[PDB]
Amino acid sequence: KIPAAVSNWKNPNGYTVALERRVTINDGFMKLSEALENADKKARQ
Amino acid sequence: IRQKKARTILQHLSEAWRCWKANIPWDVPGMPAPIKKIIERYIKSKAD
Amino acid sequence: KLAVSLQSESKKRYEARKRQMQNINDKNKQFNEKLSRES
Secondary structure, X not given: OOOOOXXXXXXXXXXXXXXXXXXXXXXXXXXXXXXXXXXXXXXXX | OOOOHHHXXXXXXXXXXXHHHHOOOXXXXXXXXXXXXXXXXXXXXXXX | OHHHHHHHHHHHHHHHHHHHHOOOOHXXXXXXXXXXXXX
8 A cells, every 4th residue: 555645845736734744872972071071170170 | 556556656756856855864654665665766866 | 127227226336425425625635534544
């Protein structure tokens, strides 16, 4: 069964369609931010 | 079954091409996997 | 009798489908109903 094609760009016949049809972080970032935070602490102290 | 199904399928093709140009991920829920492969095949050739 | 049977059965099928039909625009709501069948 092929679904009905609803485009987000086109509406040839002007159909008002149901709205719903018209509608993890890598660890390196943590390590980078932690290292920079420690470097800042070193500078302060 | 041909008469209406063809006009439906090629609308999915054209939508896939629009998604490719927009860099939107084309993914139609309940699309059959082989027809999905066929459409992506022709979209990739047009893209190239 | 064969001709009458075909005529009457055609009438019955036709009217039953009419009764089913009678239960923004006509085509737009038919499309929305098709989308409700899809789901």
